[PDB]
Design a protein around this ligand. Structure first.
Ligand SMILES: Cc1ncc(C[n+]2csc(CCOP(=O)(O)OP(=O)(O)O)c2C)c(N)n1
Ligand SMILES: Cc1ncc(C[n+]2csc(CCOP(=O)(O)OP(=O)(O)O)c2C)c(N)n1
Ligand SMILES: [Mg+2]
Ligand SMILES: [Mg+2]
Lengths: 802, 802
């Protein structure tokens, strides 16, 4: 247990704590301006001149003194209450507030021994911010206390709420930009309080950093009337409190006392809500939220060159852009830095004075040190059930290609028993699609957690106020809740209809970038569990929906995060349920990855045994010798290769026909896509030798690909024999139609694959047969048109091994 | 002017209109069930049997009878008030409601002459829904009355609001799913009422289709308390009204009268708001919104096999899935269809009776016929100013590579004069980034439209209650407002920081799919203006931000919509301002496209004259003969090729060094990326002959690419000489650093390009020089580290022609 969770003070905040908070605020404002402006001379020792100012002024002052003031008060709160706490910096461009926090709490020097607590360390701390060879502009993963960089705005609240799930002792004050609040993801984020339980989950306190402005505009929320603003948050299930400071001549000490008192009233109400939830965990309370309204750029000069800067969008980036170039800008910088009175905050050796930090929390309650902000320190391996009990044994008993199994059903039974073994640290998310993607075997041991109105057992099923599945119709919520759940040391999976995964393409990008920085250069930030995404209800079988739901191209996005041997991204094609089981075990064991697991949910053949899936997954691509009819590679007229359940089914049917014509070929299945890249681009891929062994040195290769052929063509550009691959993929053809028609219109059906194989071998010799196959595809289509269902010879085909 | 806009009735709704609305509701429910279930015998003529039921039951009943009831009342409203109206079907899976609407209003038969108004047409209308060779499951672009398919949920409100911009006579009732309302994009969509003006824009009426459920869960908004729900909409600036029906034994006629009365009160208030805005266009009113609460699946059987179906998520997809296979399901289907009493609604010939549609609007007020739902019918070419006046003439006067121009500034001056010439039909959108991306010359003739609080001329600048620029910190709002603005016949552009474009990747996918269906097979849906997206503040020069803001991969998404010679997608690299001008003119003239226009906003060289840009843009790729030093292609030791402003600058500097070493080469610039594809994949690309002419038959090609090298490798896979291209692209390396460092870490800087060129020509001979170049890159880096700015020999270089 960290600290003493949800304890009230029962006395006023001490005047000593008010004094330290003002000193914190002044020292973090001062060091924040130092990080932005100063390359040397951090204490302004004589001579202090323009030569000390950075040549390239980059950074964001505007948000920063607001963050610094909140951080003083959140630090004071943590310490007085001993409260386990992670904050979220929505406006992550306020990096200097976050580095200053860690430098003051002592974690910066603990993690970065060269940045010491004295004048030399402070000079280095100022210079390195946003500087070549130094550190980033934002609250990046390399800053102690970050689980959220806030570079791409919008995810503050899904992360805050994912962090408190199953984390009942954790408090998360979540600082949200008022511009950030104009984004879609942030706006739906407010509703998460219907999806957490105040007894079994922790508590988020949204703090709206209502500073009036974004980059070059006021914000929507700051300019609506106060009655609308309060109604809005009340309507989303919060008790709104509002603080206003900085707009008049109120002295700073008075402002600190009034905020501290307010913040104690808010926390008292959170403690009452927590105590009450021990007895009534079914009534959803109105959680407090804080409207925090202060001038943007607070404490900077009011006017610069006749333009209002404090209390304006003009404070957003870098005031006094000429600080190095004109004595006029320099003098204003100098008076601004002096207004904090650093001579009272730093000792002669340049260390921050003891009376500046005596109010701060210590040890693992420090914001930089808490293990929830470095969740790999808390993470334990899942207790995984034995995979063998889930195997589809129909392949072993009856033959390759047996049965009509819905593949994700085996993964659902497996996830069911993972939750049973790990009952408060593995969660499932779904955007109203968990049952639709066939993961509902999980409801045998848990419920969809819903903390909002109930009506009747006639409609409410597999749903309770507490449980380990969470659904909301929002891919942004699902992805963001899960990320933070992982970042705080836990595990899970979510599932999505495949074309809708693109809603969160840019979230996958940010979390891949977080992983990239971390695996490269932040070894103190320990491995977290991987994002595991079941990508199902795919392009080939969107039976109730249509062309709008046909887009497997998240493959292509993910290919753009496969650099530097980072190995943070995996694309897997689950050929059947036994391959799906083998992939899922690997993904559930992996760390520091995004794993995209493609699988069809339609009734389909099972091709491999589980032991075969385990060996084939490890190689990445495998020959299916029991399907090939060629002696060796020299005897091969064509390589039949596929990735995806549907392309595989169709290729396999094509191989059966080609066998029957006396064509010689081998069958290669591809599961781990990126293992096709060259060793030069991927030091864990197939060696050129294993790759030639699979695909031959010079025979034609027909490659039936689940997604866009572009992907495979780009990946194998420097592989031996690449000029002989003919990649057939999805080509933006389809509609609401039968399963044969969907593969037909993309030249993916067995008949078109058989034809392409013939074309590659001898187009002249096979002209007539190709014609007959093209004509059969028209007959099969007409049959679907006339009759309402696909031609039996298509639907009824089973691989000859069964 | 369409109809008589914003007129009140001043009498009750007639009892005749109530009677017709009930008949409409019954006939559209009946035909909706017919579309889902029946392959033949639409009037249930003896014998009516299971043989008449479809073999594959696909579709969505649940939302549909709610849509049908709203559509009856919206039709009644249009007719009584003669009100110019487009509706939005948020729950676009309710396609049958939308096809039924067009079939009843007469537009279906007008557009589809084979689907006639009689028993034969009705049989064909039922069979073709969601059927091979037939029509889609959703409210697709092929349905008259659609500007919004609603397949991917979330964009209902941005589209409704983009539609009414500059459209002061248009009324848009916007039907929103209660599950859809859980998405991020929908949730921020409610706030658009701060960004429209009630005098110069039209009016949206949000209607929340509060049916209690999404696919397999209740919805958040339906289960919160009524006080929270009303506070929420009041807080977002609406006057909420709430209608509740269907949960008890109230007779349908009474329900219609109570709704009609309510809907007249709402419209009266909209008319008062419109009249008032003629005098006070500065006070933002509280626009009505409608909470519409009715049972999901309304009018279907209450229980099926002991399970509650009406008033449940169970009504979502297809009730009675065994209708063809069991006499028990069949009998329930039969009684359900009979409950609408079709014998009263259809004549013996199968035509819909006159008393069913006498209340309907006529002519161009019909929902299927209104030209706003087919905006290409309204669209006119922009009055474009002459491009020559914007040219950067420094190239002509001083030489290729002259100056320090910020390229989008020329596009801003051009957009300024386009708004001046087309003052109410060209809009600019930006997610708080219009000025940041340098398009602010537009503010010389118009303002950012802001209909929310004002404070002071000290902070409010270039902002008024009416104007042709719209900003909100949300890429979803910007993209969705613009799409509908285009779909209703108008024009514009938006701009985005490049990595944040990925927020709306899935919106680009949907609009590309809308364009694909339209160019292929809906010739009555006339061309609309193109989406024009200035993609700037790019991966190479995100000076104040960092690794998080470094992602040029929307190129890769767009490559997945380049099929079938649809030609709906363009990727352009603006080499400089004069190329940007030539691209922009072309995009502003184009129709039926998404145009992604890449340009840097940093100070940069101008390479080509405007006349040169115009010729080079048309070819797609061009040799720069004045930069090449080789006689002919046989004399060429390496092809120096680039796409992007930054890669071009660095390649050019490399060419200067290579010239000075006596290396022979040609320089090729690439602007229209997809023109690199083969003719087989793109019938408008460079022919193999023009391509070989540019890139040679067999010399090595160094290709410096702005985005991920994957893209170019996949595109040129079947081109002559592709094996000799070495593509250098962005490789997930960078941080907050100097401009040289950013190109350095990706091997993109001039020195690394010079080295790669040498390596490709003779690695052995040039070993030492390569080493010296790699060492110079380290020295330049160290210099940035030590000094705070890049080495002058790097920054101060100007191409020798100046
Ligand atoms: C999704 C997204 N779009 C655009 C941006 C560009 N951007 C970086 S900061 C900023 C303004 C943020 O304003 P606000 O949230 O009010 O933060 P403040 O500095 O006022 O605290 C913008 C638009 C972004 N970071 N993320
Ligand atoms: C962005 C997105 N995610 C997921 C889906 C999958 N989906 C299609 S309909 C639906 C439920 C919609 O419920 P609601 O909006 O309440 O509409 P209803 O049928 O109740 O009117 C879902 C989740 C989608 N269409 N779009
Ligand atoms: Mg702000
Ligand atoms: Mg609903």
């Amino acid at each position: 247990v960290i600290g003493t969770p949800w304890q009230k003070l029962d006395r006023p905040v001490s005047e000593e704590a008010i004094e330290g908070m003002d000193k914190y605020w002044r020292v973090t404002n001062y060091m924040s301006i130092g990080q932005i402006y100063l390359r040397s001379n951090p204490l302004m020792k004589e001579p202090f001149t323009r030569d000390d100012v950075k040549h390239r002024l980059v950074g964001h002052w505007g948000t920063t003194p607001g963050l610094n003031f909140l951080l003083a008060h959140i630090n004071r709160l943590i310490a007085d209450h001993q409260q386990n706490t992670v904050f979220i910096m929505g406006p992550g461009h306020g990096g200097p507030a976050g580095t200053s926090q860690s430098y003051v709490d002592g974690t910066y020097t603990e993690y970065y021994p060269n940045i010491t607590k004295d004048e030399a360390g402070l000079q280095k701390f100022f210079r390195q911010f946003s500087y070549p060879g130094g550190i980033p502009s934002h609250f990046a993963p390399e800053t102690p206390g970050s689980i959220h960089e806030g570079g791409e705005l919008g995810y503050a609240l899904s992360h805050a709420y994912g962090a408190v799930m199953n984390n009942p002792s954790l408090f998360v004050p979540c600082i949200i930009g008022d511009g950030e609040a104009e984004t879609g993801p942030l706006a739906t984020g407010w509703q998460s309080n219907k999806l957490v339980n105040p007894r079994t989950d922790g508590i988020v306190l949204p703090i709206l950093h209502l500073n009036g402005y974004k980059i070059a505009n006021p914000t929507i929320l700051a300019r609506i009337s106060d009655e609308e603003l309060h109604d809005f948050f009340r309507g989303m299930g919060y008790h709104p409190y509002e603080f206003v400071a900085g707009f008049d001549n109120e002295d700073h000490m008075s402002i600190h006392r009034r905020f501290a008192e307010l913040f104690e009233t808010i926390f008292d109400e959170i403690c009452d809500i927590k105590a009450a939830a021990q007895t009534d965990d079914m009534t959803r309370p109105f959680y407090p939220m804080l409207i925090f309204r202060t001038p943007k750029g607070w404490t900077c000069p009011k006017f610069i060159d006749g333009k209002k800067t404090e209390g304006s969008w003009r404070a957003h980036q870098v005031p006094l852009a000429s600080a190095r170039d004109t004595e006029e800008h320099f003098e204003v910088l100098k008076g601004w830095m002096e207004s904090y009175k650093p001579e009272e905050l730093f000792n002669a050796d340049g260390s921050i004075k003891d009376d500046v930090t005596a109010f701060m929390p210590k040890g693992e309650l420090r914001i930089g040190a808490n293990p929830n902000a470095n969740g790999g320190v808390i993470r334990e391996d899942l207790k995984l059930p034995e995979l063998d009990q889930y195997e589809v044994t129909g392949v072993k008993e009856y033959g390759h290609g047996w049965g009509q199994v819905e593949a994700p059903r085996a993964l659902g039974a497996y996830c069911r028993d993972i939750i049973k073994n790990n009952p408060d640290s593995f969660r499932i998310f779904g955007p109203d699609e968990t049952a639709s993607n066939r993961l509902n075997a999980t409801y045998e041991v848990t419920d969809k957690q819903w903390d909002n109105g109930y009506l009747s057992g006639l409609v409410d099923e597999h749903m309770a106020v507490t449980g380990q599945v969470t659904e909301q119709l929002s891919e942004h919520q699902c992805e963001g809740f899960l990320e933070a759940y992982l970042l705080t040391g836990r595990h899970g999976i979510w599932s999505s209809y495949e074309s809708f995964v693109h809603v969160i393409d840019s979230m996958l990008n940010q979390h891949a970038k977080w992983l990239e920085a971390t695996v490269r250069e932040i070894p103190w930030r320990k491995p977290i569990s991987s994002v595991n995404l079941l990508v199902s209800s795919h392009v080939w079988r969107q039976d109730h929906n249509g062309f709008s739901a046909q887009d497997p191209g998240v493959t292509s996005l993910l290919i753009n995060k496969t650099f530097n041997n980072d190995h943070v991204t995996n694309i897997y094609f689950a050929t059947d349920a036994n391959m799906l089981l083998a992939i899922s075990e690997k993904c559930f064991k992996s760390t520091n990855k995004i794993n995209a697991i493609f699988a069809g949910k339609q009734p389909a053949p099972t091709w491999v045994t589980l032991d075969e899936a385990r060996a084939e997954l490890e190689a990445g691509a495998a020959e299916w010798k029991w399907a090939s009819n060629a002696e060796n590679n020299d005897e091969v007229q064509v390589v039949l290769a596929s990735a995806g359940d549907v392309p595989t089914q169709e290729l396999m049917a094509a191989s059966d026909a080609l066998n029957k014509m006396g064509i010689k070929f081998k069958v290669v299945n591809v599961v781990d896509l990126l293992k096709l890249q060259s060793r030069e681009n991927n030091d864990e891929a197939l060696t050129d030798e294993e790759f030639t062994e699979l695909f031959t040195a010079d025979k034609p290769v027909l490659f039936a690909y689940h997604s866009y052929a572009q992907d495979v063509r780009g990946l194998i550009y420097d592989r031996p024999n690449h000029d002989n691959f003919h990649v057939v993929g999805y080509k933006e053809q389809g509609s609401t139609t039968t399963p044969f028609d969907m593969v037909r219109v993309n030249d993916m059906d067995r008949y078109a694959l058989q034809a392409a194989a013939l074309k590659l071998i001898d187009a002249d010799k096979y002209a007539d047969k190709i014609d007959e196959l093209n004509a059969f595809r028209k007959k099969a289509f007409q049959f679907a048109v006339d009759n309402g269902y696909d031609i039996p010879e298509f639907t009824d085909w089973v691989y000859p091994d069964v």
